[PDB]
Amino acid sequence: RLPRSKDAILLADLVDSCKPGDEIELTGIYHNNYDGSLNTANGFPVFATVILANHVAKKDNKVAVGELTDEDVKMITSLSKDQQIGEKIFASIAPSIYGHEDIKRGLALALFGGEPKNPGGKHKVRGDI
Amino acid sequence: ADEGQARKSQLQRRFKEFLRQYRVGTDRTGFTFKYRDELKRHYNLGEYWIEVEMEDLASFDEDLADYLYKQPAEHLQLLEEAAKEVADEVTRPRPSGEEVLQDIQVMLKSDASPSSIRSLKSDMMSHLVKIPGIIIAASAVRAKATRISIQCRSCRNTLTNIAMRPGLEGYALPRKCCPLDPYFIMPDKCKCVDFQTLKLQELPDAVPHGEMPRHMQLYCDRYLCDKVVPGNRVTIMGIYSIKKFVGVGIRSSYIRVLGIQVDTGAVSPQEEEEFRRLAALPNVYEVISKSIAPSIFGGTDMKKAIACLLFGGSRKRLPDGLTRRGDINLLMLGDPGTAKSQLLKFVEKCSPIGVYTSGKGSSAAGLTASVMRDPSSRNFIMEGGAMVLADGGVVCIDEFDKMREDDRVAIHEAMEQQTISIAKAGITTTLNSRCSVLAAANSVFGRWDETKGEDNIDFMPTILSRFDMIFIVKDEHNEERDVMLAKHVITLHVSALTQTQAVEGEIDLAKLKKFIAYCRVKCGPRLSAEAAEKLKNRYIIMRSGARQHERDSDRRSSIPITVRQLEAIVRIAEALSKMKLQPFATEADVEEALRLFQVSTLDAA
Amino acid sequence: VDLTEPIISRFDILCVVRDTVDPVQDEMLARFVVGSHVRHHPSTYGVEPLPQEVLKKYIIYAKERVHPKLNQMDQDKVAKMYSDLRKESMATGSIPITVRHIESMIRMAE
Amino acid sequence: SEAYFRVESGALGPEENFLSLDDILMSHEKLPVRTETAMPRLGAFFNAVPQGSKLELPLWLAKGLFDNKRRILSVELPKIYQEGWRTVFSADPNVVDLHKMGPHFYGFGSQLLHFDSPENADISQSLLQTFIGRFRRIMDSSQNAYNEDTSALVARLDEMERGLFQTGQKGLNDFQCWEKGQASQITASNLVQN
Ligand SMILES: Nc1ncnc2c1ncn2[C@@H]1O[C@H](COP(=O)(O)OP(=O)(O)NP(=O)(O)O)[C@@H](O)[C@H]1O
Ligand SMILES: [Mg+2]
Ligand SMILES: [Zn+2]
């Protein structure tokens, strides 16, 4: 079936909260107003509608560094003190898969990733794995 | 109101005294009135503009600088009028034919750190802003009225010298003298200036992750017109403002430009002295070769070929009108992971004009030129592809083997004739494509497989002939080279933190770029007579060798050896001479050209 | 594999998984799979994992608030390793193209 | 002070300077002629060159062969000194490219008067009015183009006008160095390059 759609208005700081292709989660006021173009298109007193936005989240970016709390940072930095943190992270990738420890290790290294750099300001090399 | 006129007069007087009194220097050496002398020399040259630095204005009178930052639209008019009267008292008396005083455009610049397009929120409206970007489109110059005179259509009364507001905003004609719209604008009795709209794309460094690059409309005025072309990188100082002719209370925004800074051709005499010294010192060729891609270990002959490509030969127009290309076309076939793409990414950065394209990401129209319908006019218009955007420069086609054959066919005219002939949609022209093609590709079988021979190349002979030099850069395993290369790579990765210091026996990238531009515009060499004799004889021996190899194989070689290769050697020698700013190519220059082409010909054995 | 060298060499990490028979390992794997199926009803680890919410927070923290620098990595050791890795690869069938594998090691250390 | 100075150009005078490199290069430029009598042994150059032959040969050689009786050859003006190009100069002297139209335009034109052409007066008046028209732009550009690329300004100028431009630039640079105090320092000569 064809999908339905709605227009939404972002104001002030909510602009640039999303881009095309973003699976957003939008809170807003469902607002309606008279529209003569829709009236002549439908032949009835049909009112256009738009969502006056009040919050935009994303359903893939469920966590972000701009939302991390001091307690989250504290427990993260406490976990890093453990000498088993590498093994814990490797065991934590796809825990419902038995074995494949080398695969989990490689995927952890790719998931965290290296550091991009540009020595001399003239020669780029990627950081991603 | 008299109080308002008093305020305007006081601010104009303060700007006048800034332009009259500002000095640079010290009592230990001396003083020069910077803006007085700039006004005098520019007016006597007929330039009628100056470039007032905001930092200098702040040092003289901080309140004026703050007012000009917060309210530039109000105060730039006063500053321009102040500059006009200062120019009058500085230049008069003037000779015959120069009695009438001319208006002065006060451009301005700043040392402040720039903002960005996505940083331009609503609170920046009507303020001075300084943003970087790339010009992607440039309008043709059009006339905008600065003062008009309007005549009543019925009774022929006239209102004259009505001041038009600057920028894209217009003026409302009065509805009282007669009819409801009594007036028409007199086309003769009005004064107009050049204006030009541009589109400034956000810097690729500045685009946030996952976003498309934004772009901003610019308005350039008077002497800012044609100061920048598409493909240039600029810092634009201007006034963020609304156009003033879905939703209701919305107005489109643009930047009224008042200062353009090309972030990277008029060289200073000091820079010219430096370039002449560089051309004069004996090992400039090796210095340039070391300066090209200094982070890339080895590949010194390929770097030398890239040097010859960057400097290029000399275009020649012969008595019958036929033109010979000076540009050098360089193909780099070979194994993967061999810094070919990095060398292309260096050349794009280093060439005075440089355009980087992926072969797989390109199309025939997008490379040469596109014909598209203008949405606002219904006519078909021309759009420059990469080879037009790179005219007078280098095209870096990476992953060149991934193009479809019909798209590689499109560049045949532009590679050799250096023109793009178009006959589409009723518009028929011959654009210029005076550019060098630097291409990179991998073997047919991934790595170069020596057992399969000529099957490692899928390119046609016709397009292979158009490349001046063809490198088959094989990746040959060797423990000593591998150890030294790995040490170089690891130290390079460690050196990402050490302040970007320079190196002995090397030219900085910016200085090398400017030196290439200087040598390109200045020097066009030729061959010496005995050098031409040597090249003639060696060409005969080379052609005989190629013919005998083809006969022994009983198969035509993939890479041909033709008159284009002779002329390729000619223009390589001319490029080597142009590095040294010599009017002639010696036997040694031809010898180095033969050596480079022999490396590129062993790669075709 | 049927892939070519220019596309193989761009992958920093190559992984091979084989479903070879080994009855003790098959018993362990099958018991774990049945355990997962009964555990997740709608209703080699030895270390215990993090909770996945904690792991997401950990990853997103580490990718922004941390930028590992490189100052010393035993250059001669890595260079010797890469050189004889190239020597052995020349005789066999996987492709350490020159710098990409060196930089893969640098990226993995980071 | 005792700096090197080239032998000055005497091209505008009744006769050019013997030792002037500029005059030598100026007189090297070729000049169309018609030969009035056949010349043996010179068919290797242009065995006899026949009578009535059109030739282009150097101005020094034309002056050498030319006697006022017009016994050996007749001398014809180059196109840039004939009436159409004189009219082009009369239109606006500032836009013509005297660097491309012979680099020694005024010197060649002045020595072209030696052959006693019937339009010598027209040539002389054209040269004088061309110089008068171009003088103000030369003066302003030379005396106000401070510390910048002078290539576009100096491009369209003949060698005499280029010398005037360099004189004006030298005066400007001298005064600016004085005003900024750099003239007081004692410095090594240009020969420190060696
Ligand atoms: N000699 C070298 N010196 C320094 N870096 C090198 C060298 N050879 C390869 N590299 C690095 O290897 C990486 C890949 O280089 P690249 O520019 O893609 O070579 P390439 O031959 O064009 N790869 P491909 O597109 O598969 O042919 C980059 O990080 C380069 O800096
Ligand atoms: Mg590539
Ligand atoms: Zn009226």
PDB file of C-alpha atoms in Angstrom, chain B residues 425-577:
ATOM      1  CA  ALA B 425      18.817  20.847 -28.272  1.00  0.00           C
ATOM      2  CA  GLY B 426      19.448  23.456 -30.969  1.00  0.00           C
ATOM      3  CA  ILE B 427      22.446  24.991 -29.140  1.00  0.00           C
ATOM      4  CA  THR B 428      25.704  24.339 -31.017  1.00  0.00           C
ATOM      5  CA  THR B 429      29.072  25.465 -29.614  1.00  0.00           C
ATOM      6  CA  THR B 430      32.699  24.383 -29.072  1.00  0.00           C
ATOM      7  CA  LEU B 431      33.719  24.806 -25.430  1.00  0.00           C
ATOM      8  CA  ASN B 432      37.366  24.911 -24.352  1.00  0.00           C
ATOM      9  CA  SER B 433      38.875  22.055 -22.322  1.00  0.00           C
ATOM     10  CA  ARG B 434      42.537  23.117 -22.075  1.00  0.00           C
ATOM     11  CA  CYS B 435      43.306  20.722 -19.226  1.00  0.00           C
ATOM     12  CA  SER B 436      45.539  17.786 -18.305  1.00  0.00           C
ATOM     13  CA  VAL B 437      44.026  14.359 -17.572  1.00  0.00           C
ATOM     14  CA  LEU B 438      45.683  12.433 -14.738  1.00  0.00           C
ATOM     15  CA  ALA B 439      44.136   8.953 -14.526  1.00  0.00           C
ATOM     16  CA  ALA B 440      44.515   5.994 -12.163  1.00  0.00           C
ATOM     17  CA  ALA B 441      43.379   2.428 -12.799  1.00  0.00           C
ATOM     18  CA  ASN B 442      43.912  -1.167 -11.698  1.00  0.00           C
ATOM     19  CA  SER B 443      44.740  -4.174 -13.842  1.00  0.00           C
ATOM     20  CA  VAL B 444      42.001  -6.269 -15.430  1.00  0.00           C
ATOM     21  CA  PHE B 445      42.861  -9.135 -13.049  1.00  0.00           C
ATOM     22  CA  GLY B 446      43.257  -6.896  -9.983  1.00  0.00           C
ATOM     23  CA  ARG B 447      47.010  -7.298  -9.722  1.00  0.00           C
ATOM     24  CA  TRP B 448      49.187  -7.110 -12.808  1.00  0.00           C
ATOM     25  CA  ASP B 449      49.653 -10.724 -13.958  1.00  0.00           C
ATOM     26  CA  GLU B 450      52.811 -11.040 -16.045  1.00  0.00           C
ATOM     27  CA  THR B 451      51.824 -14.437 -17.473  1.00  0.00           C
ATOM     28  CA  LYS B 452      48.766 -12.951 -19.215  1.00  0.00           C
ATOM     29  CA  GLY B 453      50.658 -10.038 -20.780  1.00  0.00           C
ATOM     30  CA  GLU B 454      48.576  -7.594 -22.807  1.00  0.00           C
ATOM     31  CA  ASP B 455      45.327  -9.044 -21.403  1.00  0.00           C
ATOM     32  CA  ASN B 456      45.982  -7.017 -18.218  1.00  0.00           C
ATOM     33  CA  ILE B 457      44.848  -3.869 -20.122  1.00  0.00           C
ATOM     34  CA  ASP B 458      41.256  -3.394 -21.323  1.00  0.00           C
ATOM     35  CA  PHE B 459      41.638   0.216 -22.508  1.00  0.00           C
ATOM     36  CA  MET B 460      41.349   0.751 -26.241  1.00  0.00           C
ATOM     37  CA  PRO B 461      44.436   1.725 -28.287  1.00  0.00           C
ATOM     38  CA  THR B 462      42.749   4.996 -29.274  1.00  0.00           C
ATOM     39  CA  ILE B 463      42.455   6.230 -25.671  1.00  0.00           C
ATOM     40  CA  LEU B 464      45.832   4.757 -24.682  1.00  0.00           C
ATOM     41  CA  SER B 465      47.476   6.756 -27.480  1.00  0.00           C
ATOM     42  CA  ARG B 466      46.098   9.985 -25.965  1.00  0.00           C
ATOM     43  CA  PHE B 467      48.029   9.462 -22.701  1.00  0.00           C
ATOM     44  CA  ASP B 468      51.482  11.034 -22.897  1.00  0.00           C
ATOM     45  CA  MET B 469      52.875   8.686 -20.224  1.00  0.00           C
ATOM     46  CA  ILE B 470      51.538   5.314 -19.049  1.00  0.00           C
ATOM     47  CA  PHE B 471      52.899   3.839 -15.812  1.00  0.00           C
ATOM     48  CA  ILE B 472      52.379   0.173 -14.997  1.00  0.00           C
ATOM     49  CA  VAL B 473      53.283   0.665 -11.334  1.00  0.00           C
ATOM     50  CA  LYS B 474      53.701  -2.920 -10.168  1.00  0.00           C
ATOM     51  CA  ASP B 475      53.956  -3.631  -6.444  1.00  0.00           C
ATOM     52  CA  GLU B 476      57.156  -5.704  -6.262  1.00  0.00           C
ATOM     53  CA  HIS B 477      57.792  -7.480  -2.965  1.00  0.00           C
ATOM     54  CA  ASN B 478      61.162  -6.896  -1.295  1.00  0.00           C
ATOM     55  CA  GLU B 479      62.080  -7.125   2.385  1.00  0.00           C
ATOM     56  CA  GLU B 480      64.370  -4.076   2.459  1.00  0.00           C
ATOM     57  CA  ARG B 481      61.853  -1.815   0.712  1.00  0.00           C
ATOM     58  CA  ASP B 482      59.077  -3.245   2.881  1.00  0.00           C
ATOM     59  CA  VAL B 483      60.976  -2.555   6.127  1.00  0.00           C
ATOM     60  CA  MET B 484      61.873   0.999   5.122  1.00  0.00           C
ATOM     61  CA  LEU B 485      58.343   1.651   3.833  1.00  0.00           C
ATOM     62  CA  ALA B 486      56.776   0.383   7.060  1.00  0.00           C
ATOM     63  CA  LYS B 487      59.123   2.535   9.147  1.00  0.00           C
ATOM     64  CA  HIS B 488      58.215   5.544   6.991  1.00  0.00           C
ATOM     65  CA  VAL B 489      54.488   4.819   7.339  1.00  0.00           C
ATOM     66  CA  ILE B 490      54.625   4.392  11.111  1.00  0.00           C
ATOM     67  CA  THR B 491      56.686   7.555  11.595  1.00  0.00           C
ATOM     68  CA  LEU B 492      54.229   9.361   9.304  1.00  0.00           C
ATOM     69  CA  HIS B 493      51.336   8.231  11.501  1.00  0.00           C
ATOM     70  CA  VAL B 494      53.294   9.338  14.576  1.00  0.00           C
ATOM     71  CA  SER B 495      54.000  12.703  12.889  1.00  0.00           C
ATOM     72  CA  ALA B 496      50.287  13.663  12.825  1.00  0.00           C
ATOM     73  CA  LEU B 497      50.854  15.630  16.083  1.00  0.00           C
ATOM     74  CA  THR B 498      54.129  17.532  15.485  1.00  0.00           C
ATOM     75  CA  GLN B 499      52.879  21.014  14.506  1.00  0.00           C
ATOM     76  CA  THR B 500      53.048  20.368  10.700  1.00  0.00           C
ATOM     77  CA  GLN B 501      56.675  21.494  10.486  1.00  0.00           C
ATOM     78  CA  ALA B 502      58.420  21.971   7.140  1.00  0.00           C
ATOM     79  CA  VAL B 503      61.298  19.871   5.766  1.00  0.00           C
ATOM     80  CA  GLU B 504      64.690  20.738   4.295  1.00  0.00           C
ATOM     81  CA  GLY B 505      65.043  20.654   0.522  1.00  0.00           C
ATOM     82  CA  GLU B 506      61.299  20.998  -0.030  1.00  0.00           C
ATOM     83  CA  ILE B 507      58.755  23.565  -1.230  1.00  0.00           C
ATOM     84  CA  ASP B 508      55.593  24.182   0.768  1.00  0.00           C
ATOM     85  CA  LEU B 509      52.389  23.143  -0.993  1.00  0.00           C
ATOM     86  CA  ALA B 510      51.078  26.709  -1.296  1.00  0.00           C
ATOM     87  CA  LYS B 511      54.412  28.052  -2.555  1.00  0.00           C
ATOM     88  CA  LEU B 512      54.668  25.183  -5.052  1.00  0.00           C
ATOM     89  CA  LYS B 513      51.129  25.933  -6.263  1.00  0.00           C
ATOM     90  CA  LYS B 514      51.874  29.629  -6.782  1.00  0.00           C
ATOM     91  CA  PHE B 515      55.201  28.805  -8.456  1.00  0.00           C
ATOM     92  CA  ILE B 516      53.421  26.463 -10.880  1.00  0.00           C
ATOM     93  CA  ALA B 517      50.912  29.206 -11.718  1.00  0.00           C
ATOM     94  CA  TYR B 518      53.702  31.752 -12.272  1.00  0.00           C
ATOM     95  CA  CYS B 519      55.718  29.434 -14.523  1.00  0.00           C
ATOM     96  CA  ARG B 520      52.596  28.450 -16.475  1.00  0.00           C
ATOM     97  CA  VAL B 521      51.563  32.004 -17.298  1.00  0.00           C
ATOM     98  CA  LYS B 522      55.089  33.347 -17.875  1.00  0.00           C
ATOM     99  CA  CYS B 523      57.279  30.841 -19.742  1.00  0.00           C
ATOM    100  CA  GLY B 524      56.597  29.001 -22.981  1.00  0.00           C
ATOM    101  CA  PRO B 525      59.706  27.085 -24.148  1.00  0.00           C
ATOM    102  CA  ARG B 526      60.687  25.494 -27.454  1.00  0.00           C
ATOM    103  CA  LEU B 527      63.131  22.783 -28.517  1.00  0.00           C
ATOM    104  CA  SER B 528      66.684  23.603 -29.485  1.00  0.00           C
ATOM    105  CA  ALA B 529      67.614  22.489 -32.993  1.00  0.00           C
ATOM    106  CA  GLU B 530      70.183  19.825 -32.079  1.00  0.00           C
ATOM    107  CA  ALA B 531      67.883  18.608 -29.298  1.00  0.00           C
ATOM    108  CA  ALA B 532      65.129  18.185 -31.892  1.00  0.00           C
ATOM    109  CA  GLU B 533      67.586  16.247 -34.077  1.00  0.00           C
ATOM    110  CA  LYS B 534      68.358  13.924 -31.153  1.00  0.00           C
ATOM    111  CA  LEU B 535      64.658  13.404 -30.452  1.00  0.00           C
ATOM    112  CA  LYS B 536      64.019  12.687 -34.145  1.00  0.00           C
ATOM    113  CA  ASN B 537      66.662   9.948 -34.290  1.00  0.00           C
ATOM    114  CA  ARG B 538      65.584   8.388 -30.999  1.00  0.00           C
ATOM    115  CA  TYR B 539      61.953   8.380 -32.166  1.00  0.00           C
ATOM    116  CA  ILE B 540      62.920   6.399 -35.277  1.00  0.00           C
ATOM    117  CA  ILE B 541      64.814   3.837 -33.182  1.00  0.00           C
ATOM    118  CA  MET B 542      61.895   3.563 -30.737  1.00  0.00           C
ATOM    119  CA  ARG B 543      59.317   3.084 -33.506  1.00  0.00           C
ATOM    120  CA  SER B 544      61.453   0.408 -35.166  1.00  0.00           C
ATOM    121  CA  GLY B 545      61.722  -1.401 -31.833  1.00  0.00           C
ATOM    122  CA  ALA B 546      57.956  -1.283 -31.305  1.00  0.00           C
ATOM    123  CA  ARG B 547      57.275  -2.568 -34.832  1.00  0.00           C
ATOM    124  CA  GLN B 548      59.737  -5.438 -34.442  1.00  0.00           C
ATOM    125  CA  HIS B 549      58.271  -6.395 -31.056  1.00  0.00           C
ATOM    126  CA  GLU B 550      54.775  -6.478 -32.564  1.00  0.00           C
ATOM    127  CA  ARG B 551      56.045  -8.600 -35.464  1.00  0.00           C
ATOM    128  CA  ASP B 552      57.809 -11.024 -33.106  1.00  0.00           C
ATOM    129  CA  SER B 553      54.658 -11.419 -31.012  1.00  0.00           C
ATOM    130  CA  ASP B 554      52.467 -11.547 -34.158  1.00  0.00           C
ATOM    131  CA  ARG B 555      49.992  -9.490 -32.116  1.00  0.00           C
ATOM    132  CA  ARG B 556      49.370  -5.760 -31.865  1.00  0.00           C
ATOM    133  CA  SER B 557      50.537  -4.310 -28.561  1.00  0.00           C
ATOM    134  CA  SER B 558      47.908  -2.779 -26.293  1.00  0.00           C
ATOM    135  CA  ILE B 559      49.889   0.447 -25.771  1.00  0.00           C
ATOM    136  CA  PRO B 560      50.757   2.133 -29.120  1.00  0.00           C
ATOM    137  CA  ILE B 561      53.769   4.282 -30.013  1.00  0.00           C
ATOM    138  CA  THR B 562      52.743   7.084 -32.387  1.00  0.00           C
ATOM    139  CA  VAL B 563      53.345  10.710 -33.364  1.00  0.00           C
ATOM    140  CA  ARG B 564      51.383  11.628 -30.229  1.00  0.00           C
ATOM    141  CA  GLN B 565      54.138   9.963 -28.217  1.00  0.00           C
ATOM    142  CA  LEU B 566      56.729  12.046 -30.090  1.00  0.00           C
ATOM    143  CA  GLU B 567      54.819  15.229 -29.274  1.00  0.00           C
ATOM    144  CA  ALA B 568      54.413  13.916 -25.718  1.00  0.00           C
ATOM    145  CA  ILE B 569      58.196  13.758 -25.375  1.00  0.00           C
ATOM    146  CA  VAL B 570      58.359  17.274 -26.871  1.00  0.00           C
ATOM    147  CA  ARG B 571      55.965  18.764 -24.328  1.00  0.00           C
ATOM    148  CA  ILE B 572      57.566  16.824 -21.447  1.00  0.00           C
ATOM    149  CA  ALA B 573      60.900  18.427 -22.349  1.00  0.00           C
ATOM    150  CA  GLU B 574      59.154  21.797 -22.563  1.00  0.00           C
ATOM    151  CA  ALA B 575      57.639  21.230 -19.107  1.00  0.00           C
ATOM    152  CA  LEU B 576      61.092  20.446 -17.707  1.00  0.00           C
ATOM    153  CA  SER B 577      62.396  23.668 -19.247  1.00  0.00           C
TER     154      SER B 577
END
